[PDB]
Design a protein around this motif. Structure first.
Motif, PDB file in Angstrom:
ATOM      1  N   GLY B  88       0.706  -1.360  -0.114  1.00  0.00           N
ATOM      2  CA  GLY B  88       0.070  -0.066  -0.081  1.00  0.00           C
ATOM      3  C   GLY B  88       0.733   1.427  -0.289  1.00  0.00           C
ATOM      4  N   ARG B  89       2.147   1.158  -0.055  1.00  0.00           N
ATOM      5  CA  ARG B  89       2.911   2.449   0.074  1.00  0.00           C
ATOM      6  C   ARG B  89       3.114   3.051  -1.274  1.00  0.00           C
ATOM      7  NH1 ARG B  89       5.976  -1.229   3.981  1.00  0.00           N
ATOM      8  NH2 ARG B  89       5.624  -0.414   5.901  1.00  0.00           N
ATOM      9  N   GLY B  90       3.492   4.365  -1.399  1.00  0.00           N
ATOM     10  CA  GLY B  90       3.370   5.225  -2.252  1.00  0.00           C
ATOM     11  C   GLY B  90       2.094   5.342  -2.717  1.00  0.00           C
ATOM     12  N   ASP B 393      -5.303   4.916  -2.988  1.00  0.00           N
ATOM     13  CA  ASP B 393      -4.611   4.602  -1.654  1.00  0.00           C
ATOM     14  C   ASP B 393      -5.417   5.968  -0.704  1.00  0.00           C
ATOM     15  OD1 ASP B 393      -3.915   7.084  -3.185  1.00  0.00           O
ATOM     16  OD2 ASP B 393      -1.801   6.984  -2.063  1.00  0.00           O
ATOM     17  N   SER B 460      -0.810   2.899   4.979  1.00  0.00           N
ATOM     18  CA  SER B 460      -0.037   3.208   3.843  1.00  0.00           C
ATOM     19  C   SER B 460      -1.285   3.453   2.793  1.00  0.00           C
ATOM     20  CB  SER B 460       0.673   1.946   3.353  1.00  0.00           C
ATOM     21  OG  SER B 460      -0.326   0.896   3.172  1.00  0.00           O
ATOM     22  N   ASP B 461      -2.379   2.636   2.787  1.00  0.00           N
ATOM     23  CA  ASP B 461      -3.578   3.146   1.498  1.00  0.00           C
ATOM     24  C   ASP B 461      -4.764   2.839   2.378  1.00  0.00           C
ATOM     25  OD1 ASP B 461      -3.590   0.172   1.781  1.00  0.00           O
ATOM     26  OD2 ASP B 461      -3.559   0.010  -0.392  1.00  0.00           O
TER      27      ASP B 461
HETATM   28 NA    NA Z   1       0.431   4.802   0.115  1.00  0.00          NA
END
Ligand code: NA
Ligand code: HEM
Ligand code: HEM
Ligand SMILES: [Cl-]
Ligand SMILES: [Cl-]
Ligand code: NA
Lengths: 714, 714
Positions: B88-90, B393, B460-461
């Motif tokens: 989920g990062r970015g 996200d 993260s999201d």
């Molecule tokens: Na994210």
């Protein structure tokens, strides 16, 4: 290994040092107050437990001579011994020996064992005694147990919960000898500031001699220079070294290759300990810590006058320990020194190279002979210097807690007189602010003067600040950054306002010059807001007192001189480190976050706080008015910036269309438009909806700085 | 440079990732609420400003074709395009493109220009619109301005103030081709989890083809693999790529060696900009960004179906741009594509290798033909894909703010039904807790079930959590970590309690299973406290709803499976990364600090939360009682720890004197007694004064976990 921003841009600026020590990393509640907890501790109960521990030997690290006292004295002395006078950083005051890197420095080998012996006491008393206080108290109890009367003890060192960011040097190899690609020495053995040790991972000096050369006379030079950089003069240094080496022993029972990984490198099963040794049993009689194998006295577990009797009563021969280290042995002596584990074994007196320095350096020899001949003077000097050692980073006496605090005021504590009269109240403060503003002092003079007075504070050792009015004294009144001639004019006008206010009072009410400096600073900030069309009140808290010149050690104050103060766009000379790095370092010593550093600097620029009235970073057309102009003009894409011909650290800002010069700035100014995190902060304060936020945030940070040293109100 | 702990011990665990995002680094006050600010923004006025900016060229970065729309679409697609489904990062949700490293990734070259063009609008609207939301909104307005109907827009992405810690790969060279010492590929071109790009510093794929090889068919494999890892299927991928490349152009007017330092390496005078080019004017017609020199359509500033008309109406010849990049040109076509600055100059159609993938990969070809033939189907797909791209996200729809939010509920949103009935009150929650405890379910069942439901959340999201009761559905009900047979027994008993409570109500009141799972977890924690002799109430907030199977995409939920959960001492297989590293990674996705992680794990251990009732780390003789035994026993120096013979990741704890076996643990358990910062936290909770603190802090972190996804109550 995951590549980080540090890997890609290893010389970008590091703001994380301003955001260390957040409530996120802290296990205590946001309301926890250590002082209150410690004031309810039964200190006498803790000391009884520490006395018991002294001779309660654990099999995993047996006590030499049945008594851990030497080991604990070393522990305490290493806790304190990382202190550097140049920045105030290190010392015992935050308990950092339990965190990286200091927990794993070579000079701290087997101090992990010392700390783990203390876990049961720590556990039993919990939050009421910090580790930081416990390491020092344990040192004191070790001394008392062995017959030495201490000068006293103060609690109040709160624990910290992560490593401090400290520059310990640039070498990439532990204990690297000098002259390498990152040598901390240059010229005629000049140690780089702010460092206070001769090799990476040592406390002060190398006990075999300089870069391992066993010459006591040259070792003495390193001892004098490092201990001076730890705020200790020749008498204190001799007293401490001979005092400490009255106890215990060194450990070097076999080759160093037997010793394994330091704690931060050890396996998970070592549960926080390190330096596991494969030599014989690895411990006790077989211990290896330093590599030297020296026992100084005939009674290592008891205070004695034997260190100087041996030092002067024998002649000394160079020899090698069982690990191969250089050390010295007494010519022709009998075996009179007891063994730490075998009652049938005795040894000849031995000494380190650095012990012999006390005899073969001509200045130390005179002190050492005097202490030899007058042991009561040696005892008193060591007690005093042990107290200084272990308290030098604790700050003003107002922070000292508990029932064993010495009543005697010492010069090194930068003492402030007690206040013995009524303080001024809100009506009086309004009357004084009006008098200051009517005198004709300018916003720029008033702000610059208060800034100069208050911004000498550093959170590292809690020295400096506006309390004391030491800005009127030598040496601060002559520091270039303080603008001596302008300062002298401001102080004279303020001293007249003071004299007149105090002369009109009844009762004993009076105002100190320290308070009035800070109050006048506040009046200047109010006026600057008024100039911008905003009605603002700046808080003020009275109670500062004026210290005298005789309560102000001039040589000790030298280290507080700002040679770089980005908040006044000042740099005293050219330094290797870029000026924006210096700014964040100063922000850290002042306890500021990045948002607070940003607000503060933007405001100071437009108020006229620059040294010399330099126009650099003065991005406003209404100087002395408290506005967010710095940010709005910095961020304007209408302007293009280039380094000048004459000086690549000065930049000119020109209209992108016309070519016309609009501004100039330094690196400290433009870093706010460059660094991606700082520029995000600048944007917030440079936005259209931000003027009132900027004023309110500025007053809050101004007030914070003015009160940094106000531990009487904590 | 200053040597750091990271230098000396580069494989030690890094806790600082848990303490980012402190109030220290945040310039907004602790009360600032972005949603409140955004809800008062005049969004239509912002869009009218953005619409005007599209055609208002600035001479420091002239607008191609007089229109910045293509530039701003690319900016928004790269803000969103860092997203990886694995963790989920970015993604676009925190505005990370404005910080390192993303601001200086090669694939983001000249987006610094884009973002600086938006400063004046940012400045005008200040805190009411985040940079994060503005990057996205600008892309939308660019699309609208050029004639494309978007699916909608939601605000609510709060700004962040420092870089996220994200693993982007292990390469030490930008754009490093695969098969190096830190190759992110192994096997038959298998990209390592959690990566979602083919080279360090790219968004998805290399526009020349795999590691620079210009084969569209092989490029298609990289496209499919990376877009899948960004949660996009074949239809969405074709719609996005062809949709985007309906607009604007690429930039490669001369050699790449003309381009200077990326922003984080540029000089301070560049004021946050980078990639300054020495080629001719350095910008406009002479711009160099990618190196490719392609203009896809005959109207680059107007929505059309010309991208597929060209793709399918010509044959393509491999050619080189002026910077030497491979790219493709239409064989024997007329010069029908306009030039960006010279109205007298025209060009042949051109394409990237990755554009041709859409025709020569056989699966993509069928979709691309369908979109060519039915351009309204292409427009709908692109609109829906663009919304998904730029929102994927953001989390639950309860976080979406503003007047353009689409009413259609999409399956990717993991939608939660509305609640349309009275909720249970405090008396009802007490009654249900007593019923749950009287059913015979154990502390261990109740805690493990609630933990399993809630701990899917990732910050993260913002996917996962207990809302929805998706634990009862495929796939969660069958995940090994969730202990499927035990889970099914618990859920049956809870569902009978629910049916009986709801059957007895009047007036519409009912309780959801999602709420009751969380409430039962609360009852378990209360009973465990009771069992230890402590009366506590665990807070509970109702309002969760139950989602159906049909509202649950099973394939999309796969990424939420915990394959490492140190909080249940669970590791599904052997990973390269040590299990403690995985623990800190989970703590970061849960939004826990290091003290919250430590408390929570210590508590879980002694409550029976381990998968399979493993005794590892269960350092208590009163399992199911909420005590600090984990810490007291872990920190007891009476116990000696060694790795087992069978398994080096499992340790035995034996009495140091007798050799008797006391405990076993994993790396996850023993790190709390090893790592210097985690052990300092463990010490606090293992102290004799800590029982009450332990309970209270455990309850607090438990309740925090239970509420992670409750944005309906934000
Ligand atoms: Na994210
Ligand atoms: C030039 C300054 C100094 C040098 C070079 C130095 C060097 C050392 C070394 C190498 C050891 C042996 C470590 C081991 O192998 O176990 C040690 C032990 C010790 N030092 Fe120092 N020392 C210095 C100053 C101090 C000071 C100022 C104190 C305290 C006031 C002190 C107290 C101790 C004590 C008590 C021990 C013995 C520890 C034990 O019995 O385990 N030393 N010293
Ligand atoms: C395989 C996936 C993708 C690849 C390899 C790719 C590659 C590239 C490259 C190399 C450029 C030129 C950068 C420059 O020189 O200025 C660019 C431009 C652009 N791309 Fe993509 N892209 C992909 C997908 C996307 C998607 C999904 C969108 C949006 C829906 C998008 C929108 C754009 C736009 C609008 C431009 C033009 C920028 C301008 O006018 O300045 N692309 N693409
Ligand atoms: Cl420090
Ligand atoms: Cl992120
Ligand atoms: Na300090």
């Amino acid at each position: 290994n995951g590549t980080s921003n540090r890997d890609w841009w290893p010389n970008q600026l590091d703001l994380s040092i301003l955001h260390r020590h957040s409530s996120l990393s802290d296990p205590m509640g946001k309301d926890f107050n250590y002082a209150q907890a410690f004031e309810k501790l039964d200190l006498a109960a803790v000391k009884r437990d520490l006395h018991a521990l002294m001779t309660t030997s654990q099999d995993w690290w047996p006590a030499d001579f049945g008594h851990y006292g030497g080991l604990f004295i070393r522990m305490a002395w290493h806790s304190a011994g990382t202190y550097r006078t140049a920045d105030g950083r290190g010392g015992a005051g935050e308990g950092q020996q339990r965190f990286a890197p200091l927990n794993s420095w070579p000079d701290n080998a087997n101090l992990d064992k010392a700390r783990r012996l203390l876990w049961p006491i720590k556990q039993k008393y919990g939050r009421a005694i910090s580790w930081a206080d416990l390491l020092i108290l344990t040192g004191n109890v070790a001394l008392e147990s062995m017959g030495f009367k201490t000068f006293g003890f103060a609690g109040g060192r709160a624990d910290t919960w992560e490593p401090e960011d400290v520059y310990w040097g640039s070498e990439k190899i532990w204990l690297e000898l000098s002259g390498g690609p990152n040598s901390r020495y240059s010229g005629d053995r000049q140690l780089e500031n702010p460092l206070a040790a001769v090799q990476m991972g040592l406390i002060y000096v190398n006990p075999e001699g300089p870069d391992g050369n066993p010459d006591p006379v040259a070792a003495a030079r390193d001892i004098r220079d490092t201990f001076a950089r730890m705020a200790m003069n020749d008498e204190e240094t001799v007293a401490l070294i001979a005092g400490g080496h009255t106890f215990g022993k060194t450990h070097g029972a076999g080759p160093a290759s037997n010793v394994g990984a330091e704690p931060e490198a050890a396996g998970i099963e070592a549960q926080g300990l390190g330096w596991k040794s494969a030599y014989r049993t690895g411990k006790g009689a077989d211990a290896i810590t330093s590599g030297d194998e020296v026992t100084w006295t005939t009674t290592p577990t008891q205070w004695s006058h034997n260190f100087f009797e041996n030092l002067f009563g024998y002649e000394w021969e160079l020899t090698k320990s069982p690990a191969g280290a250089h050390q010295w042995v007494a010519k022709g002596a009998d075996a009179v020194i007891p063994d730490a584990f075998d009652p049938s074994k005795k040894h000849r007196p031995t000494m380190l190279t650095t012990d012999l320095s006390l005899r073969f350096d001509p200045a130390y020899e005179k002190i050492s002979r005097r202490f030899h001949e007058n042991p009561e003077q040696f005892a008193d000097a060591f007690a005093r210097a042990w107290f200084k050692l272990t308290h030098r980073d604790m700050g003003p006496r107002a922070r000292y807690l508990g029932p064993e605090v010495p009543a005697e005021v010492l010069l090194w504590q930068d003492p402030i007189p007690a206040v013995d009269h009524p303080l001024i109240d809100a009506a009086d403060a309004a009357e004084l602010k009006a008098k200051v503003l009517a005198s004709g002092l300018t916003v720029s003079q008033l702000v610059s003067t208060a800034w100069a007075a208050a911004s000498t504070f550093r959170g590292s050792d809690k020295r400096g600040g506006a309390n004391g009015a030491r800005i009127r004294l030598a040496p601060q009144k002559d520091w270039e950054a303080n603008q001596p001639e302008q300062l002298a004019a401001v102080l004279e006008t303020l001293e007249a306002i003071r004299t007149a206010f105090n002369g009109a009072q009844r009762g004993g009410k009076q105002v100190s010059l320290a308070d009035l400096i800070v109050l006048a600073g506040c009046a200047g900030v109010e006026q600057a807001a008024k100039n911008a069309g905003h009605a603002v009140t700046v808080p003020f808290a009275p109670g500062r007192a004026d210290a005298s010149q005789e309560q102000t050690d001039v040589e000790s104050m030298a280290v507080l001189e700002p040679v770089a103060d980005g908040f006044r766009n000042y740099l005293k000379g050219k330094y290797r480190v870029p000026a924006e790095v210096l700014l964040v370092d100063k922000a850290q010593l002042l306890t500021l976050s990045a948002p607070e550093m940003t607000v503060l600097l933007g405001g100071l620029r437009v108020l006229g706080a620059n040294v010399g009235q330099s126009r650099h970073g003065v991005f406003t057309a209404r100087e002395q008015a408290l506005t967010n102009d710095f940010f709005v003009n910095l961020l304007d894409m209408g302007t293009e910036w280039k380094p000048t011909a004459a000086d690549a650290d000065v930049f000119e800002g020109r209209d992108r269309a016309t070519g016309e010069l609009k501004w100039t700035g330094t690196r400290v100014d433009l870093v706010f438009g460059s660094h991606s995190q700082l520029r995000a902060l600048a944007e917030v304060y440079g936005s259209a909806d931000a003027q009132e936020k900027f004023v309110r945030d500025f007053v809050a940070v101004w007030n914070k700085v003015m009160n940094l040293d106000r531990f009487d109100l904590a």
